[PDB]
Write a protein that binds this ligand. Structure first.
Ligand SMILES: CCCCCC(=O)Oc1ccc([N+](=O)[O-])cc1
Ligand SMILES: CCCCCC(=O)Oc1ccc([N+](=O)[O-])cc1
Ligand SMILES: CCCCCC(=O)Oc1ccc([N+](=O)[O-])cc1
Ligand SMILES: CCCCCC(=O)Oc1ccc([N+](=O)[O-])cc1
Ligand SMILES: CCCCCC(=O)O
Lengths: 309, 309, 309, 309
C-alpha cells in the first residue's frame, strides 16, 4: 500500500464518507459549485494584503477578467507572477484559488495576477490557452492599469493551470513578450497524456482527483493529442526557462510531471523536481483540512526564491 | 458564556477560522454545494443496508423522488418512517442526509423513506409541504412499489424537515391517510416564528446555523406568518400524535422547539422533550467531526423505541 | 362530556352507588382507614418478592420508618428508588401503597424504599418534606442497613408524594446527597396551586379525588403558598434532573402537572410528559377495579427504563 | 559552434597554445604534479578558516587521511559535508582541491571533511569507494576526534568524486550509518558509462577533460562495467536522498549527469538539476583563471542551502 500521511488519509476518508455524485453526474453549474465548496472548506483562509484588485485585459474572444494581488501598495520594477487556476479547464475560477494566490503573494513578496480564462465545454481547447497567453503578454507589457512594472514574468498554475504554465512559456519562448519568462512553476501539471500511465491506474480512485474526473475534463476540453498546446511534452524544450516542477506521490497524473522534468533534463535545462510524499493532487488548496500541505507549498516558495537568485 | 462540549467547540473554531461568505453572498448552487460539503465531510459514513433503492410517487406538481432504506430485504407489516431533510426548504437533498437515513434505518430496524421534496426559491411555500404530505400519504397506502406494508407512519425530519414533520402530522390528523401517524419526531424544528426569541439573539452568530442563514431561507421560501402550514405552532394540537421533540441547547431556533413541546403539554398530549446540552443545530449530521453527537442521535432512537412500544 | 374509559366509568359509578361520607365528615382515624380500604379493595395484589423488609433511619424529629422492597436478596450497585406515598400529607402510609411498591420493584428490577413520613394535621408542613428529604439522603449514602449500594436515587411518588418527589429533587439539587438524583417520577403531582385551575373546576366532583378533599388536605397541611417546598413550581428548574411527569386527563390537579412539565421544557430540561387518557387521579392504585390502569403504570415503567439508559 | 563564455574560451585557447603532453605521454608522477600545478594556478586562493586540521580514520586497508575545514572552532550539531576530490581516481589529493574545500566551508558555514582515498593504478576499483564509504561512516558516527556533532552527512565531490558521492549515498542507503545522508551533491559526476554518449563525441578534445584522459583513467581504475559501485546509474534509486546534480554544458560526460538526474525523477526523488552554460568540466577548480565560474559554484551553494531547509 502506498504511503499516505495521517492527516491526508483522514481527509480521504471523509471524502469517501461523503460519497457524492461524480462530476459527470452533476450539472455543469453543480460541478463548478462543488469545487468552490471543496476549496472553500479545505483551504486556509485568505491572507490580508494591501492590494486585491479586479482588472481586465483584451483577449481574442473579448475581455479577460483578472485579479491583482500585492502585499505592497507601491513597488518598483520586478518580476510579476501570472497565475492560472486548476480545474481541468472546465471548473474553477478566481475565487476557488483566491486564498492560494494571497498566500503566494504574501510569501513571495511579489505581485500576482490571476487569469479568469474561458472554460470548456462552453469554450473548448484552445480557449483557455488563448486567454492565459494573452493575459500573460499583457502583464508583460507593463500596462498602466496594473500599476507596477514587470521586468519578467513568472507563469505558475496547478494541474490544468500547470499545463497552461508550460504552454504559455513555450508560446512566449517562440514569440517573446516585452519581457522574458524568468521562471515557470507548473504544479502537478498535465504535460504528457496520462492515459496508459502507471500512476493513472494506481491512483484512479480515492485520491481526490479520480480517473473519472480526468475523463470528464478531457471530454469537455477536446484537446488534440498531437497538439503541443494540448500536451506540451510534445513541444520544443531546448530553450525552456528555469523551471520548478512540483508533483504529488499519490497523483494519478504524477507520471506526467515526472515525464516533463525528465524532458527538461534531457534538453539540458535547469529544473527543480519536487515530488511531495504522502499527499495527493490539489495539495496546494487543502492547506486547512490537511495542515501538512502548508509545508509542501512553503517548499515550492523556497525553491522559487532560490531559482530567482 | 453558554456551555459547549469540547469537541463541539473545536468544530465551531474550525468554521470561524474558515471565515466563509454567508449563504446570501454565494450563488444559490454554491450555497447548496456548501451544505453538501458540510454534511459530507462532517458526518459518519453510511451504514451498509440490504436495501437502498430510488423510487418515486405521484405528487401535485409531478413525480416526487424518494429513497427507500431498509436493513432487511423483506419484512412484515409494521410502521414506516417517512423522513424530510433539513436545509431551510432551500438547500439539502437526498444525499445531504443519506448517511443519517442509513443510520436511522440501521438503529431502528424499520424501513425509512426519504422525500426529495421541491425546494425554494424555485418552488416557494407550500411546495415542500405539498410534496412531504403527498409522499407520506403514498407510503401510508402500502403501494406495491415500496414492498413494505405500512401499519402506521412515523414522520421525522431535522429543522425545516422538523417543520414539515409537524405540518404533515397536522394535515394527516385532519384528513387521515390509510394508516395513522403513530409517532412524530421533529428534530430541532421550526414550529413558531423565531423572530424575537431569546435563543435567536443569543446564538445569532457562531453556532453553525446563523440568523443570517435563517433570514436567507425565509426570504426564499416565503411562508405566510398566519398560515399553520408555515408555522405549525398555530395549528390545532388537541389530537397531536405521540411526539418526540429534540432540540439543541445552542440553537438559535431552540426556543421554537421549546414552544412546540410546551404547546403539546398544554393540550394534554404525550411528548418526550430532549434538549441536547452543549451542541448546536445540525448535530444529527456532524457525527464524525463532533463524535459526541452520535450519542445524541442514539438517545433519540432510544426514545423512539420506547414511544413505539 | 370528557372522555372516560368504560372500566373507569363503572368504578366511578360504583363509588357513587356506595355513597360514602366525605373526609370532613369522617374522623381522622376513619378517613385514614377508608383510604386503606379503598386501595386494599381497588388495587391488584402485591407481588411476591424476595425482600420486603422494614427499616428506619434518623430524622429531624426522630426515626423515620421505611420499607425496603427488592426482587433480589443480593444485587450489584445501581440506582435505588425512593418512594413517597400519596394521601394529601394527611392519610396513607406504608400499607396503602404497598402493592404498588411491590409492582414497581418487580417491574423495574430495582430496590424500592418507601418512606413513612410524618402526617398532618398532627405534623403540618414542612414535616412530611423534612422526612422525605432525610430518608432520601440516608438511602443515597448507601448505609450498611440498606443491604445494597446506591449509585444514584430515583424519587417517585403519587400526588402529595409527587409534590414530595419534586421538592426532594430540588433540595438535593441545591445541596447534593452522596449520589445524584438520576431521575425523578412525579405521578399526578401537586406542583402549582390548583386553586383557579380549569381542571379543578371541571373535575371538582365525581372523579375519585374531589375539590372537597383537596381543601380538606390543604387545611390540615398548612403549606405556605410562597414556599417552594410547598409549591415547587416556584423552585429553580434550571438544573432539574431527568423527569417523567405522569398525569390523568380527568384529574382536578391535572393542570398542576401540565404546569410543571411546561416549566421544565421552558428551562431546557429533559422531560417525558404522559397524560393518561380517560382515567382519574389515583390510577396507580386501582389496577384491579379498573384493569386498564395496569397498562398506564407499565407505560411509566417503560419510560423510566428508557430514561435511565 | 557550441556556446563558450569569453573568459572560458580564453582559458581553453591558452591551454591549446601550451600544447602539453597527454596523460598517457607522461609518467604517473608527472601527471599528478601537472594536475597540482593546473589547479594551483587556475583556482582562487584558499579562504582563511578558523579550523584546517589533518585527521585520520580507520579504513579497510589502514588509516585513511582526512582534512577538516571549518569556519568555526566550536559549533552546534548539524550536517557535516564529506568531500571526495576528482582526478579520475588516479590523480588529485587533499591539496589539489584544498582551496575549493575552504570555499565550500566558508560559504556554507558547515564543516567539510575531505577524504584522501586510495588511488589507481596502485589501488584499482573498488579501493577509492571503500575508503570514501568508510570515511563517511566514520564522520557520521560523530567521533570525539572530529570535534563537532553530525546530525547528518552531505556527500559531495567533483567528477570521480561525484561518482563516489552517488556510490556512497547508495551504500549508506542500503546499510545506514549512524545518521542519514541528508543531501548529496554530485558535481559533473560519472554515473553512467560515457562510452557512446553524444556529449563524449561532441567534446572529445579541447574542453579540459578529454576523451583520451577518460580512457586513461578507465584503464587505470578498472571498474567493473556491471557493478553499481563503478557505475551507480545501475543502482537502486527508489530511496535516493535529496540531490543536486551540477553539470557543465561543454563536458564530455555531461550526458552521464543528465542520465542520473533523469533516473532520480523517474524514481520520484527530489532533485535540483543545474547545467552550467558555456563552461567545461572542472569549473569548480578554475575559479581564478575563469572568474565567471565562481558564480557557478555560488549557484550550487544557494541550491544546497535551499535543499537543506
Ligand atoms: C473534484 C476533484 C478535483 C478536480 C479539479 C482538479 O483537481 O484540478 C485539475 C485540473 C486539471 C486536471 N487535468 O488536466 O486532468 C486535473 C485536475
Ligand atoms: C449552513 C448551515 C445551515 C444549513 C441549513 C440547516 O441547518 O437546516 C435548516 C433547516 C431549516 C431551518 N429553518 O427553518 O430556519 C434552519 C436550518
Ligand atoms: C379518597 C380520595 C382522596 C385520597 C387522597 C389522594 O387521592 O391522594 C392525594 C394526595 C395529595 C393531594 N394533594 O396534595 O392535593 C391530593 C390527593
Ligand atoms: C587533466 C585534467 C582532466 C583530468 C581531471 C578531471 O577532470 O577529473 C576527473 C575525474 C574523474 C573522471 N572520470 O571519472 O571519468 C574524469 C575527470
Ligand atoms: C437565551 C440564553 C440561552 C440559555 C438560557 C435558557 O436556558 O433559557
Amino acid at each position: 500500500t502506498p504511503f499516505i500521511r495521517p492527516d491526508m488519509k483522514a481527509f480521504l476518508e471523509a471524502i469517501a464518507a461523503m460519497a457524492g455524485p461524480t462530476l459527470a453526474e452533476m450539472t455543469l453549474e453543480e460541478a463548478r459549485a462543488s469545487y468552490v465548496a471543496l476549496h472553500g472548506m479545505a483551504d486556509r483562509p485568505a491572507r490580508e494584503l494591501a492590494v486585491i484588485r479586479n482588472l481586465s485585459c483584451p483577449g481574442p474572444a473579448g475581455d479577460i477578467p483578472l485579479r491583482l494581488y500585492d502585499a505592497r501598495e507601491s513597488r518598483e520594477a520586478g518580476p510579476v507572477i501570472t497565475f492560472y487556476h486548476g480545474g481541468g479547464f472546465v471548473i474553477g475560477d478566481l475565487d476557488t484559488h483566491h486564498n492560494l494566490c494571497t498566500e503566494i503573494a504574501a510569501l513571495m513578496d511579489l505581485p500576482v495576477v490571476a487569469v479568469d480564462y474561458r472554460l470548456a465545454p462552453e469554450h473548448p481547447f484552445p480557449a483557455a490557452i488563448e486567454d492565459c497567453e494573452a493575459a500573460t503578454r499583457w502583464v508583460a507589457s507593463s500596462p498602466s492599469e496594473l500599476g507596477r512594472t514587470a521586468s519578467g514574468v513568472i507563469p505558475i498554475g496547478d494541474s490544468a493551470g500547470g499545463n497552461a504554465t508550460i504552454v504559455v512559456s513555450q508560446l512566449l519562448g517562440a514569440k517573446p513578450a516585452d519581457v522574458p519568462v524568468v521562471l515557470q512553476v507548473p504544479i502537478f501539471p498535465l504535460a504528457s497524456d496520462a492515459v496508459g500511465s502507471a500512476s493513472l491506474e494506481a491512483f484512479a480512485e480515492g485520491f481526490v482527483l479520480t480517473k473519472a474526473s480526468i475523463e470528464f475534463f478531457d471530454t469537455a476540453y477536446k484537446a488534440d493529442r498531437a497538439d503541443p498546446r494540448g500536451f506540451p511534452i510534445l513541444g520544443d524544450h531546448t530553450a525552456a526557462p528555469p523551471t520548478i516542477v512540483a508533483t504529488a506521490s499519490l497523483d494519478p497524473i504524477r507520471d506526467s510531471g515526472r515525464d516533463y522534468a525528465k524532458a527538461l533534463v534531457e534538453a539540458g535545462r535547469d529544473v527543480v523536481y519536487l515530488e511531495m510524499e504522502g499527499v495527493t493532487h490539489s495539495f496546494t488548496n487543502i492547506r486547512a483540512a490537511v495542515p501538512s500541505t502548508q509545508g509542501d507549498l512553503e517548499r515550492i516558495i523556497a525553491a522559487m526564491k532560490m531559482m530567482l537568485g
